[PDB]
Structures are given as structure tokens and as C-alpha cells.
Amino acid sequence: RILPEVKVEGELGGSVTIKCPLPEMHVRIYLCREMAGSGTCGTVVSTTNFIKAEYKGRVTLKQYPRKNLFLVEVTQLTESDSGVYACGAGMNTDRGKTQKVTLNVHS
Amino acid sequence: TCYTYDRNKCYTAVVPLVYGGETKMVETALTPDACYP
Amino acid sequence: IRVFAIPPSFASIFLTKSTKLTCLVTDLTTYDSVTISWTRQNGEAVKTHTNISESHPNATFSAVGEASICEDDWNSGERFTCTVTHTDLPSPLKQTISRPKGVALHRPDVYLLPPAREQLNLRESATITCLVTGFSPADVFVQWMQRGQPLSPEKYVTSAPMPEPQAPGRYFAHSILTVSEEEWNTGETYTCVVAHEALPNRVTERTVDKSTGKPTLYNVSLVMSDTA
Amino acid sequence: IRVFAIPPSFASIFLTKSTKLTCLVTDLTTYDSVTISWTRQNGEAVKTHTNISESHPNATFSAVGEASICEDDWNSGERFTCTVTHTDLPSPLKQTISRPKGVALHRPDVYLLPPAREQLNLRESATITCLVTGFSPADVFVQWMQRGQPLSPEKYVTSAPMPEPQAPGRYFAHSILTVSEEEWNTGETYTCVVAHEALPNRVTERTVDKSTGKPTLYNVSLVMSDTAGT
């Protein structure tokens, strides 16, 4: 259970990529934005071709088996992308998260 | 006897499929993703 | 060198409300001076014909014709004929098309299965299935309407009628809608509306909500003790 | 006259160890000396078939031409051709079977939906639906088991693999199984077992019964003892 909250800055032009651990056994690896009001977790990026409706076409998945870092990148920032993005595995999304971190706008 | 499934363990079974006359009883997976072939 | 006939399907009668049957021309030379008409049993004239097609690579011509008729004149049973007289076909040929025989009409039964609970764990997208079983004849129409405004036709996919195994020649066909997983945990209703030519008022509708698969009661019992 | 070109289903290549290929003729006249031959893309001939079938009651003949090939040849994408020559047609008709490579392999997801609540009110029949989504390519094998034994295809009907709305090339398929209403209320657990290439084990399954699919009773009798203990 890792909690590496980083302060990577963002903007419209700006791009921030998160780093995540991979089991490398070709399971379901996902990044999920937790919703405070909902109390559940909503997958923003998954192993399959699913992408969140708000994040359609502005996100990229980048997997290296060589270096054991699982990383996802966001092309543009609307400044609303401030929340607990947690990575993970297994079919489940909520109860399967491995590491969580909250990104940030401006700085 | 247990209630739950160990996430790092694999549980499987023999499923009796046929496809016609022959019956290749093949090992299925009751827990896809905790173990791979 | 033939002329075929295409009637408006019941999925178009229910949708267009402006019934229009056409006749298409297969393998005739791309020349002008063609005869086009729609004659019913008594043979009286109909609405004018427009929308002449263009040239084709295989040197064919399709002189089609769109006309406006009553939806109930077909119910009256008007034997319709599309007469075509081309230069390469000096002898005119007659066509035949109408509302056909009375089949044993049965009723559609729409059941509406919500997405599985274990599907609602990976949080990608739910899938609601509107199953229309046990109808006859074919040509059923299905569409979706969340709240009250018909979903855009590329979100849902409808299959084709297929015969039912445990029944005589009565089909079964059902289609699904792939909703977002963050929309099926709000309340967000999804009605499914079906039109078949054997229904009382020609339309049936069903609706599954989030608060439909919840259990009626819990029966927990804690028996905390201290023995073994 | 009609001639078919049926590629070998995965349920054949993986189960029968007989990854052959057959081309069937129909809609022709009842005649003999039909020259139906399988060839590779180089023009060379391969092994022939046997046990010519019998005609249909529809006063139309039916015959099949079969050729046995190895699996690695199939997984390479070779263009095999079945040619039919007969007196009816002055030009022999050719049909091509191959494997278009360059398609991704996705693992099917199996969802077992029990019959709806209002369907278990007429007390006439119950329909359980096995839905396989996301699998690519098509031609997946699905069947049903009732208390650990399979059923004939006379009680369950599967659907052809249709494309998916939001997916580029992924598909989906439905398999409905209809049973008597009282055959589902007393228990009698049903299982849907599927077998698509992409599965890591090539075979998976799901299961439902009356106490699992959308239950109306969480009958719990949990007991906890020896709280202090050692």
C-alpha cells in the first residue's frame, strides 16, 4: 500500500504522467479517480479500450515491462483534474487499488 | 474449509465440454486473474 | 435485366409514418426514356416519382420511385404493380408487391435484464439487455429512451430475429445498450420501447432502474459467544 | 448452385485435434462425378475426403470436400482454395479460406444474467442469458451444463457474433437457455462454459442458481466464538 503523493503541476498545454507498479502478468491494470461525493472509484484508464467520457482522446497508456514502472500520461489539463488517482490490478476497481496519489493544477 | 479466495492462489476445475461426440474434459478457471497458465 | 420490389418494413412504417414502397431496377443499360408507375388493383395513378439514380461502373441503371400512400391502403390490400419499359426490354414486365398473408400473430413479451453485479465492479460500462421473446411474425422494432428522449442510434445495438428452440416458428431477438458505469449508479432510468405489428396498441415499453435488483430484506444474525 | 467455404472453428482445432477444412455444395441437381478438390495457394494438391453424404429431402444434393492440415499452417495465414468442377457449370467455382492476421486477441468477458422478475411470474418458463463481450475475433464456442453434465443444443440457442458500439473491433454474443419455471426455483444450478482463443486457459465458465441471481433473501447465520482465546 504505497502513497506517493506528488505535486506535478499542470495546465492546458501541460502534460503530466503518473507512475504505477505492474505485476506484469497481463491482468487488468487501471488508473482510477476516486470520487469524494460518490464514495466509490471510477476508472479513468483501464487495460481495455475504455476511456472516461471527460478524458476521451486526451489520455495515453504507456507500459514498460523492462523497468517496472506503469505510467499514464495526460495531454491537456483543464485544471479540474485534482483528485485521488489510484493505480491497481485485478478485475475489481475500488478494492484492488495498489498505490494512490493526487495530482495538481498550476504547480 | 474456507469462505474466501486467496488472491495469490489459483483455483481451477475440470469442465466437461464436448463439441460433438468426443469429450475433452479440460481444466477451467474459477478465478481468472489470480493465476495464469 | 430484372426489376425487384422493396416494401417499407414495419420498422419503417412505425418510424417514417409516411409509408413508401419502391421498385429497383437490376442490370439495365444506363439509358433514359424509362417507364415508371405504381398501379394498384383498379390501376389508378399515384403520387409522382422522383430521385433518379446516377451512372454505375457495371453499366446498370436503377430507376427507382418514391410515392406517398396511406398507411391503411396497404391494410386494405392493394396489389401493387411497378411497370418498367426500357429500350433493352421492348416487352414490358409486371411487378408484384403487397401486404401479405395473415400469419398467426403472437405477442412480444419484453423483459429487461439489468447489468450483472460482478460486471459492476470494474467500473467501465454497464450493459442493459432488452429481450423481446416469443413474437410472430418477424420485423420487430426496438429503441431506447432514457427519461423521455430516444437515445442516439449508435449507442444501442439490436440483433436479428431467430427461431425459438422450445416453441414453434416464433422468433426471439434482443438488443443491448451500453451505458456508462457512472450513470447507472445515479438512478438514471433507461426505458426500452418496442413496436410489433401484433401488439394491442402496437407499442410496449419496459423499464429497469438501479433500485430494482436490491434485495427485499436482510436476515443477518450475530451469535457472538465464548465456547468453541 | 451453391458452394460453401467453412473455416475450421476454434472448437474444432482445440478439441478434436483435427484442424481440417471442409467445403460443402448444395442447391445443385442430383448428379455424380462431382470434382470437389482442396488445394493450397501454390496449386499443389492435398489429401482428399471420404464418405460422400446423401441427398436432401428437398430434392437437392449435398456433398462435402475435406482436407486435413496442421495447426501451425493455419496460424500463419495461408490461402487455401476449394474448387468444384461439374458438368452443370462450364467454369469450376473456387472458394478461398485463410486467416487474416493483424487482428488483436482480446479475452472474452462472461456475464450470466438470470431471468427477470416478471418472467418468473407467469410460471411458464425462465430464460438465462450468457453474454460474452469484448472477444476478438469471432467464432467462439459456448455451451451450457446442468448439475455438471452438458445439455443438447435443442434447449439453448446462441447468437452470431455482432460488433460492439464503442469498440473498434471487439464483438459480443448472446446465448439464451430456456428451462421450465419449476426447474429453476428448487435449485438446479446452471453453468455457462465458453472457450475462445484468447482465454489464458482457453476455457472459462460462470454459474447461477436461484439463490445467487438477484436474490431477495440474505439468509445469514454467522457465529463467532472464542473471542478472547489465546
Place this chain on the structure above:
Amino acid sequence: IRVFAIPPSFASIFLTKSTKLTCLVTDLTTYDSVTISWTRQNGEAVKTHTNISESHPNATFSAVGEASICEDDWNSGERFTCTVTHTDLPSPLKQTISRPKGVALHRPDVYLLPPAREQLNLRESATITCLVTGFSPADVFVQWMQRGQPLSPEKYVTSAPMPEPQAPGRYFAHSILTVSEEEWNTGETYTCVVAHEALPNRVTERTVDKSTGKPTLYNVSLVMS
């Protein structure tokens, strides 16, 4: 001398599905030689009314003529004139009637309200009430189906559309269905179908059943000891 024009009613357009418009000729002196007909905007001819009425008992020579028309005609609003011929009439009298456009169509909002607990406790009958509300204009049609089969009109009662109290120009209606106590306690969804011309598909329906509420009823029964 009077000619009322009874228009095709939306409660008959949806029920009969054989749209016809009536030319009720009233208060003529008792005579003979009457040939009444209809014309379209094109002086359209119409099939003669079947079983045309004779001179009235009241001495009013009342002639009722019903002419079949295509539905599109009525919805289009194409006008129709009923030629009326009497021995008394030198010129055929004309009854020009057209469906009138110009009224905003607001969709109905059926809400089915379930039988009240008190009625149920007495155990004699239940009234389940559709409340089609918000509809505009009037002439809404309401009926009840159970197991997909419509019920007899003598079992449910539908009220007339009264104007909405607080909202602007709009109407509301009611429909009570009386059922036995045991029939509502075993299932029997009693779908309430409302047909109105402002609906997207002209047909809606809602369902209320013995289990259409009553949320999770827990039963924690701890025996800690």
C-alpha cells in the same frame, strides 16, 4: 336547419383505428329525399354513410352521416365540408370542419399512485390511480392492461380533463381502477397505458405492483452473550 359537426375524437381514433367524422344534421321539418355527403379541401368526395338515419321520433329530421377518411387528412388539418341535402333545402348545406392547429402540445406525465394502506387494512377493494397530468391539450385516452390484456371499461373509471389549478393553460385527469384485496397481494402489475397526441410515441405506460417500494427490511438479530 342546424348541422352540428362531430369531429373524430382521439378516444375513438386510438380505439376504433378507423377514423370517421360525423355530420349530425338536426332540427329539420319531417320530409324525405335527403342525400348528405362530404367534401375535402379538394371538394373531396366521400363514401356514403352506412345505415343512414331516417326522420327522427322528435320530428326533427335528424340525419347522421359518418364518412371514413384517411387519418393523415385529419392530422394535416385539411378541412372537410358536409354537403347536406333536404327537400326543404334549396342549396346543399355545408358543414366545414377541420382539426384546429395552434395549441401547444405538452407531454403528459403519468404517475401511478398505489392503493392506500388504510384501504388495504379493511381488506375489501383497492383503488390504484393514474394521474395523467400536465397534458395539453385535452382529449387524452387512458386504459389499463393486466398481463398485457386490456381490462373491460366497466372496471376502471376515467375522469374528464379539468384545467390545472396553479400552472398556466394545461389540463389534468384521473383514472381509478378498483381491484380485489387478494388480487393486488399476489402480483398483477396493472400497467396503466396513456395515449395522447403530444407523447413522443403517442403511447406511455407505468407499472405499480405489490412490491414497488418497501425498501430493505433488515433483521439484525444479535445474540451476544
